[PDB]
Design a protein around this ligand. Structure first.
Ligand SMILES: *[C@@H]1O[C@H](CO)[C@@H](O[C@@H]2O[C@H](CO)[C@@H](O[C@@H]3O[C@H](CO)[C@@H](O)[C@H](O)[C@@H]3O)[C@H](O)[C@H]2NC(C)=O)[C@H](O)[C@H]1NC(C)=O
Ligand SMILES: *[C@@H]1O[C@H](CO)[C@@H](O[C@@H]2O[C@H](CO)[C@@H](O[C@@H]3O[C@H](CO)[C@@H](O)[C@H](O)[C@@H]3O)[C@H](O)[C@H]2NC(C)=O)[C@H](O)[C@H]1NC(C)=O
Ligand SMILES: *[C@@H]1O[C@H](CO)[C@@H](O[C@@H]2O[C@H](CO)[C@@H](O[C@@H]3O[C@H](CO)[C@@H](O)[C@H](O)[C@@H]3O)[C@H](O)[C@H]2NC(C)=O)[C@H](O)[C@H]1NC(C)=O
Ligand SMILES: *[C@@H]1O[C@H](CO)[C@@H](O[C@@H]2O[C@H](CO)[C@@H](O[C@@H]3O[C@H](CO)[C@@H](O)[C@H](O)[C@@H]3O)[C@H](O)[C@H]2NC(C)=O)[C@H](O)[C@H]1NC(C)=O
Ligand SMILES: *[C@@H]1O[C@H](CO)[C@@H](O[C@@H]2O[C@H](CO)[C@@H](O[C@@H]3O[C@H](CO)[C@@H](O)[C@H](O)[C@@H]3O)[C@H](O)[C@H]2NC(C)=O)[C@H](O)[C@H]1NC(C)=O
Ligand SMILES: *[C@@H]1O[C@H](CO)[C@@H](O[C@@H]2O[C@H](CO)[C@@H](O[C@@H]3O[C@H](CO)[C@@H](O)[C@H](O)[C@@H]3O)[C@H](O)[C@H]2NC(C)=O)[C@H](O)[C@H]1NC(C)=O
Ligand SMILES: *[C@@H]1O[C@H](CO)[C@@H](O[C@@H]2O[C@H](CO)[C@@H](O)[C@H](O)[C@H]2NC(C)=O)[C@H](O)[C@H]1NC(C)=O
Ligand SMILES: *[C@@H]1O[C@H](CO)[C@@H](O[C@@H]2O[C@H](CO)[C@@H](O)[C@H](O)[C@H]2NC(C)=O)[C@H](O)[C@H]1NC(C)=O
Ligand code: NAG
Ligand code: NAG
Ligand code: NAG
Ligand code: NAG
Ligand code: NAG
Ligand code: NAG
Ligand code: NAG
Ligand code: NAG
Lengths: 383, 383, 383, 383
C-alpha cells in the first residue's frame, strides 16, 4: 500500500474555520485518494500544522516536528519570513519544500530543494508591461501596498530607462483603509491610467473609494496585478464605462476545471464572508488553486518513483534524506495540466516562469477574456 | 565579579582572518574590560559563532547553542535572511538581539526584542532627497544593485509624485563587475546626476569604469548612498572637476573618536587587502563602527542594572528570560556618544531614525565636510 | 671575403644594457651576415663606441678613433650637438655619416657627406597641417617640449598667415613631469583640439595627467607629432570617447616586417621597463626601426660597388677617402623597402622628404589605421 | 711682466680686410696695453686664428692649436655650429670660453666654462613684449629670417596664451633679397604692426622694399629686434610719418663711450662698404661693441688674480687647467661698465640677462631715445 505523508504548515485561524489553502490541501489529497488513475496503488495522508505565519521560530519548530514524525514534502508556510526559515530546513535535510506563494529569493541562497508554483513576477511584470504598451500608455501610476511590492514590479519601474513612459510610484496607506487622500492626489494630478499592486481583498476596497470619488468614469483605466480579478462583485462598475484590465491564470474555461470549482463551493461553504466586501460568494482564489495544483504535481513525481520510502529525520543530527536528490529532480521535471493551466518549472532556479495567462477586461456584461499572454509569444489579444 | 557573556554570530571567513565586525566585537569587549569607568565591577566575555550568513538553519542552531550555554544578548548575523531567523528566537526567549545592519522589517512582525544601530533608510532616503533639492536637480538616475535596494530608497522613488523630478531607476549587472554597458546607456541618455545605492567596495569599482568611460568630468555629479565614502582612494578623481557628494556618520572630527580609529589600524593590520581595489588601507568602515557602538550601548544598560544574572534557556522548551523585559527597555532608553555620534533609539519600533550625518563632497584637496544633516533641522550646509 | 667595418657612435647607458639603437645596429648587421641574398660575398663587422651624447668633444674624439682604425660609414650620435660635430669630421675626410634622428640643418652648412633617414619635419608638419584641415579645425593649441620644437613644427605655426586658424603655442614644464598647471590653463581656456610635439615616453605621461584632469572626454581631440603612437598602452583611453590621431611610418601591416618585430622582442627582452609607464612591452620604436633601415640602405650601396676598400685616415692630416665621392652618391641613389616603408632620399640636400605614412586614430577597439599620407597625393583617408 | 695670451677664433674674410669683431679684439688688447690703470704690471698678446665659421672641424682643430700653444681664454667663433664645438673643448680642458654672440644653449649641456656677453633673448623678448603692450597692440606680425629665430623670440610667440594678441608668424625669403611677395601679403592682409627679427644689414634692405611698396606711411609701425637700429641711414624715412621703435644697448650718451667710437672710425676706415646699402659709414656695431667688452671683463679677472700662469694643454691627453676653476668664477663675478653699459653675468647659467636698454624711436629729427628698459623695473618711457 505504502501510505505517503505529505506534510503542510498553514495559518492558525482562531475564530473562523481552516483557511482556503488548508481546505485546498485537504481537498486535493482526498481527490487523489478517491480517483484511481493517479496513484493506483498508494494513498496520501497529511500532517498539517498551524502557525502564526509571522513567526519564523514557530515555523522552524513545527517543520522539524514533521520531519521527526516523517514527511515527504512540506507545503509552504504562505509568508516570506516564515517560508525562508522552512526553506533552509528542507535544504539541509533533503526533503522538498513546495511553495505556492511569491517570496523574495535573494540572489545568494544556494538552496536547491524548493519549487514555487506561483507565477513569478519576473514574468508577470513583463505581462503588465506588454499590456501598457498594447494600450499605448505614456503616463502610468503604480500604486503598491507594502514595500516588497517594489521587488515584485521592478521590471515595470525600470521601464522609462528603456521605453517611453513616466512612472509615478505611489503607496497605499499603511495603517488604514482610508485611501481617499491617496485618490485625491491622483485625481488632482490627473492620473487616469493606474496600475494597482494589491490583493483582491484590498482591490475591492479601493474600487468603493474610487466610486465614492469621481474616479470610475470613461476616462480612468485600471490594470490590476492580482490574478483574482474574476472574484470581484463588478456589478456597480459595469455601466460606468471604466476599463478594468487584468489577468487570470485560473483556467475557468474548461468543463473539467470548472467542475472542480463547482464542487469547491460545497465543502467550503461554512458561513461565507462579510456582505460589505465587494467580492463574490462561491469562488476559488488562485491562492487555493495553486495548493490544489501543488499536491498533484508532486503526485506525478510519486507516480514515476515507486521505490519511495518515507524516513524519519532529525534537525539536530541533520542527514540528507536517502531519496531526496532524485525525488526533487522528478518534481522539477514534472508537467501537469491543473486548474491554473500547464505547470512546468524553471530548470535553472526552480521557479514558475513559463505559464499561460488570460487577459480579462471589464465590459458592459462583466469581466470578459480579451486575450492570452505567453512568454514565448506575447499578447495575442483578440479584443 | 559577575562576568557577562554577550554572544555573537558572525561570518565564517575560510581563507583570511576574522571579519571586520568580529574584530570590532572583540575590540569593544576588550576596551570596556581595560577601561574602569564603564562597568567598574564586571567584566565581559563572549561566545562568538561563525555561520555562512546565507543559511537560516545554521544561524538558528548556533543561536540556540548560545542560549543553551547562556548569553545576555546576540549581536546580529549581518544578513537579512539570517537575522530574521535569529530575531524570532530572541523574541520567543526574551533575550535581546542587537542589530548593526539594515534589514527589511516587514509591517506584520510583532517582535519587540530587537534594536538596530544602523541608520534607518526612512531617514537616510530623506537625507538624499533633501540633498538633491539643495543641488536643485530636476533629472535624477538611481542606480541600485540588488532588488532590496528599492525598499531602501523608496522615499526617493516616491518623489516625482510630490516634487519636480523624473527618476530613471537602473540596476547594476547582477553577475559581473562589467557595468560599462550600464554606463554607456547613461552616457548616451545624458544622465549627469546619478545616485548610487551600492557598497563602498562596489562604488570604488564603478568609479574606475566611469573613469575608463568619459564620465568623470565637470558635468557629472554623483551622490553615494553608502556611509563609507571616506574610505575610497579618491586621488585619481580630485582634479577631474567631478563632485562626489555623500554622507558620513562616523564622527572622525574628534580627538577621542580618531584615537580609537588610529588604534584600529594596529590590531587589524594582518595582510591588508588587494591593491587593485580603490579603497584605503587604514580605515574603519561604518559596519565595524556600529559593532563597536553596539557593545557600548548595551554596556550602558548593564551599568544601570546590577542585579543581572545570565540564565540558561532552551529553544525546545522556550521560556522568557527572567529579566528580559526590563533589560530590553534599558537598551531602548540608552543614550551613548560613540564613534558614529549620539546613539538614541526609536521609541516606537526600536530602530535608529534620529542621528547626525556629515555631508561630505569632493574638492581638489579631497573629501571635505560641507554640511550637517539632522532629522529635526535638515541640511545646515556651510558649503 | 673583404669584411666591411661600418662604425657607429651610440649612448653610454650606465646601469642598464645597450640602447635600442645600438641593439638595432647589431641586429641589422647580424641579419645581413646570416642572409645570403644581400651581400653574397662580404660580411659586416662593427666598431661601436659609447659617448655621453651631450658632449661634442667626446663624440669628436671617438669619431676620429673609428677613422684611424678604419671604418666605411659612421651611424650618427643620436643628438643635435653631437651629430653636428661628427657631420663635419665626416665631411672633411670623405667618409659618409648616416643619420637616423632629426637635427637642425642650418642653411649655411656646405656639407655633402650625410644622409638622414628620419622623416623630415618639413614634410611631417605638412602632414599634421593637412590633418587639421581634414578635421576642419579653426582653433589649435600646439604644445611642444623643448625650444627646438618650434623649428620642427614651423610650417604649422606659419599657418594662420595663410589658412583660417588661430594657434596658441604652449610649452610643457622644463624641469618636472607636472604638466597639470599647463592642463588647467588649457581646460579653463577651452582648448579642445591639441597638437602634442613630444616623444612617446612623454606623451604617455601627459595622457595620465589628462585623465587625472577632466580632459579625456568625447570633446577633446589630440594629434600626436610622434611616430610611435602605436607603442602606448591605450586601454584606459579606448572607452572614453576621445580621438587620438597620429601617424605611423613603421609598416606593421606586412608579414615580412612584423616577422622582424616578432623576432625583435626575443633578443631585446632583458628586464623590460617600468610598469608605471603607459607604454607596451614588446614593441620596436621608430628610432630603432630607422637604424635597422640605415644598415640596409648602405648595404645596397656596397652591393653595387664591389671594388670597395676600407682605408685608414687621420683627422690631424685630413685627406678625403679614395672612394668617398662615388660611395656617397650610391647611398643617395639607393632605394630600399625596409621596416619604415620605401626609403628614397632627397636629391637636393640628402634628407628624407618622400615617404609613406599611415594615419592612425583611436577607436573603441584600439589604434586603427584610418588613412594614408603621401607628399605627392595627400590624405587618402578611408576613415 | 707675465705677458698673457688671450686667444681668439674669428672669420676668414678672403677678399676684404679683417672683420669687425677681429678689429675690436685687436683694439681692446691694445687699449689695455696703452692704458696703465687697468693691469699696471702685465701686457696682453693674442693668437687669433681664422676659420670658415660654418665648419665645426676647423674650429675644433684651431682651438686645440691655441691650447697646445697655450692660451688663457678663447673668444668665441661667432656662430652656433662652431661655438658648440669649441665650448665643449673649453669645458673639458678648463680654459674659459668667452662668447659674444647668441647661441641656442640646449637644456642638457652640463657645461660650466662659458659666459655670453650677448644680451639674452629670454630678457630681450620680454623687452619687445613689454613694448608691444605700451603701444597697446592687439594684432602683431613677427617676421623672422632663419628658423633659429623662433627660439630667439619664443617668449613673444607664447604671448596669446596669456595676453590679448594674435601673432601671425611669417618668414623672410630664404634665398633672395626679394621680400616684396612677403610684403604684398602683409599689405593685402592689413598688417600695420610688424616685428622684424633680422640683422641691421637685412633690416636696411627690407625698408627699401617697404618704401618701394606703399608701406612707409603714418599707419605702419615697425619694432626691430636688432640692437643696431642706430646704424641705419634713416634720412629717407624721417618725414614719412612712420614709427620705427627699437632698442640700443650701446651706451652712446657718454663722453667716454662716444670717445672710443670716435676713435673707432679712424683705424677701421679701410675702404668703407657699399653705397647701395642703407647703413651709415662711421659706426660701431653691437657685435664689435661686445668684443671690446669681452676683453675688459676678463681683464677685471686677471687684475684680481696675480698668481696666474698660462699653461700648455693637449686635447688628446686632456687635463683641466690648474687655475681654471677659480679664474672662471672671477669672470662670472666680474662687474664692468663698458661700451654696452653695466656687464653683470647670470649666476645660474653664465648668461647675460641683467642689462640696461635704451628704447629708441624714429622722430622727424631722427632716431631718438624715448625710454629705458630694465629687467627689475620695466619700461620707464619718458616719450
Ligand atoms: C481522475 O483520473 C485522472 C487521474 O490521473 C485525472 O486526470 C486526467 O486523466 C485523463 C486520462 O488519464 C486525461 O483527461 C484529459 O482531460 C483534459 C481536460 O482538461 C482534456 O483536454 C484531455 O483531452 C483529456 O481528456 C488527463 O490526462 C487528465 N486531466 C487533466 C486535466 O490533466 C482525471 O481528471 C480525474 N477525473 C476524472 C473525472 O476522470
Ligand atoms: C529559467 O529561468 C531563466 C531566468 O529567469 C529564464 O530566462 C529568462 O528568459 C526570458 C525569455 O523570454 C528572457 O528575456 C525576456 O523576454 C521578454 C519577452 O518580452 C523581453 O522583455 C526581454 O527580452 C527579457 O529579457 C529573460 O531575460 C531571461 N532571464 C534572465 C535573468 O536572463 C528562462 O527562460 C527559464 N527557463 C524556462 C522558462 O524554460
Ligand atoms: C519613531 O519612529 C517613527 C516612525 O518610524 C518616527 O516618525 C517619523 O517622523 C518623521 C519625521 O518627523 C516623518 O517623516 C517625514 O517628515 C518630513 C519633514 O517633517 C515630511 O516630508 C513628512 O511630512 C513626514 O512627516 C515620518 O513620516 C514619521 N513616521 C511615521 C510613521 O509617522 C518618529 O519620529 C520616531 N521617534 C523618535 C525618533 O523619537
Ligand atoms: C628635395 O628637397 C626639396 C626641398 O627640401 C623638395 O622641394 C619641396 O617640395 C614640397 C612639395 O612639392 C614643397 O612643399 C609645399 O607643397 C605644398 C603642396 O604642393 C604647398 O603647400 C606649397 O606650395 C609647397 O610647394 C616645398 O616647398 C619644396 N621645397 C622647396 C625649397 O622648394 C623636393 O621635393 C625634394 N625632392 C624630392 C623629394 O625628390
Ligand atoms: C684708462 O683707465 C681706466 C683703466 O682701468 C679706464 O677705466 C676708468 O677708470 C676711471 C678711474 O679709474 C673711471 O672713470 C669713470 O668714467 C665714467 C664714464 O663712463 C664716469 O661715469 C665715472 O664717474 C668715472 O669718471 C672708471 O673706473 C673707468 N671708466 C669706466 C667707463 O668704467 C679709463 O676709461 C681709461 N681711459 C682714460 C682716458 O682714463
Ligand atoms: C639668472 O637666470 C635666471 C633664469 O633665466 C633668471 O631668472 C629669471 O628672472 C626673471 C625676473 O625678472 C623671472 O621673471 C620674469 O620677469 C618678467 C618681467 O616683466 C615677467 O614677464 C615674468 O614674471 C618673467 O617670469 C624669470 O621667470 C626668471 N627665469 C626663470 C627661468 O625662472 C635670474 O634672474 C638670473 N639672475 C640674475 C639676473 O641675477
Ligand atoms: C574610559 O571610559 C570613560 C567612560 O566614561 C571615558 O570617559 C569619557 O570620556 C569622554 C571623552 O574622552 C567624555 O566626553 C566623557 O564625559 C567621559 N565620561 C566620564 C564619565 O568622565 C574615558 O575617555 C575612557 N578612557 C579610555 C582610555 O578609553
Ligand atoms: C633575405 O634577403 C632577401 C633580400 O633580397 C629577402 O628577399 C626579399 O624578400 C621580400 C619579402 O620577404 C620580397 O618582397 C623581395 O622581393 C625579396 N627580394 C628578392 C631579391 O628575392 C629575403 O626575404 C630575406 N630573408 C630573410 C630570412 O631575411
Ligand atoms: C476602454 O478600452 C478601449 C479599447 O482599448 C479604449 O478605446 C478606451 O479608451 C478604453 N477606455 C478608457 C481607457 O477609459
Ligand atoms: C492567437 O489567437 C487566434 C484566435 O484567437 C488563434 O489563431 C490562436 O489562438 C493564436 N494564434 C497564434 C498564437 O499564432
Ligand atoms: C560642484 O562643486 C563645485 C565646487 O567644487 C561647485 O562650484 C559646482 O557648482 C558644483 N556643481 C557642478 C555641476 O559643477
Ligand atoms: C549650523 O548651525 C550651527 C549652530 O546651530 C551654526 O554654528 C552654523 O554656523 C550653522 N551653519 C551655517 C549657518 O551654515
Ligand atoms: C572622433 O572620432 C569619432 C569616431 O570614433 C567620430 O564619430 C567623431 O566625429 C570624431 N570627433 C569628435 C569631436 O568626436
Ligand atoms: C586610396 O587609393 C587607393 C589606390 O590609389 C585605393 O585603393 C583606396 O580605395 C583609396 N582610398 C579611398 C578612396 O578612401
Ligand atoms: C607713432 O607714435 C605715436 C606715439 O605712440 C602714436 O600715437 C602714433 O599712432 C604712432 N604711429 C603709428 C603707430 O603709425
Ligand atoms: C624714470 O625716468 C625718470 C625721468 O626720465 C627718472 O626719474 C628716472 O630716470 C627713472 N625713475 C625711476 C626708475 O624711478
Amino acid at each position: 500500500t505504502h501510505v505517503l505523508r505529505f506534510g503542510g504548515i498553514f495559518e492558525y485561524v482562531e475564530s473562523g474555520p481552516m483557511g482556503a489553502e488548508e481546505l485546498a490541501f485537504r481537498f486535493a489529497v482526498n481527490t487523489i485518494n478517491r480517483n484511481r488513475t493517479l496513484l493506483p496503488n498508494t494513498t496520501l495522508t497529511y500532517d498539517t500544522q498551524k502557525i502564526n505565519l509571522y513567526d519564523s521560530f514557530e515555523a522552524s519548530k513545527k517543520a522539524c516536528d514533521q520531519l521527526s514524525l516523517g514527511v515527504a514534502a512540506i507545503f509552504g508556510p504562505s509568508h516570506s519570513s516564515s517560508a525562508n526559515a522552512v526553506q533552509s530546513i528542507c535544504n539541509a535535510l533533503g526533503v522538498p519544500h513546495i511553495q505556492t506563494r511569491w517570496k523574495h529569493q535573494v540572489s545568494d541562497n544556494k538552496d536547491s530543494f524548493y519549487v514555487s508554483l506561483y507565477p513569478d513576477f519576473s514574468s508577470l511584470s513583463r505581462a503588465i508591461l506588454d499590456l501598457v504598451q498594447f494600450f499605448k500608455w505614456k503616463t502610468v501610476t503604480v500604486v503598491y501596498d507594502d514595500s516588497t511590492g517594489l521587488i515584485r514590479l521592478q521590471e515595470l519601474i525600470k521601464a522609462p530607462s528603456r521605453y517611453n513612459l513616466r512612472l509615478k510610484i505611489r503607496q497605499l496607506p499603511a495603517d488604514t483603509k482610508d485611501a481617499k487622500p491617496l485618490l485625491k492626489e491622483m485625481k488632482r494630478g490627473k492620473e487616469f491610467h493606474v496600475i494597482f499592486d494589491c490583493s483582491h481583498e484590498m482591490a475591492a476596497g479601493i474600487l468603493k473609494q474610487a466610486l465614492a470619488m469621481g474616479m470610475m468614469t470613461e476616462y480612468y483605466h485600471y490594470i490590476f496585478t492580482t490574478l483574482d480579478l474574476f472574484a470581484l462583485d463588478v456589478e456597480p462598475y459595469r455601466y460606468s464605462g471604466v476599463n478594468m484590465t487584468g489577468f487570470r491564470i485560473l483556467n475557468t474555461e474548461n468543463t473539467q476545471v470548472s467542475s472542480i470549482i463547482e464542487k469547491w463551493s460545497m465543502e467550503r461553504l461554512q458561513a461565507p464572508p462579510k456582505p460589505d466586501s465587494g467580492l463574490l460568494d462561491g469562488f476559488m482564489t488562485t491562492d487555493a488553486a495553486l495548493m490544489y495544483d501543488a499536491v498533484h504535481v508532486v503526485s506525478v513525481a510519486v507516480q514515476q518513483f515507486p521505490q519511495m520510502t518515507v524516513s524519519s529525520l532529525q534537525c539536530n543530527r541533520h542527514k540528507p534524506w536517502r531519496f531526496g536528490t532524485r525525488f526533487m529532480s522528478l518534481i522539477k521535471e514534472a508537467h501537469w495540466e491543473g486548474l491554473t493551466g500547464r505547470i512546468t518549472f524553471n530548470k535553472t532556479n526552480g521557479l514558475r516562469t513559463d505559464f499561460d495567462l488570460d487577459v480579462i477586461s471589464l465590459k458592459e456584461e462583466g469581466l470578459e477574456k480579451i486575450g492570452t499572454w505567453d512568454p514565448a509569444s506575447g499578447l495575442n489579444m483578440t479584443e
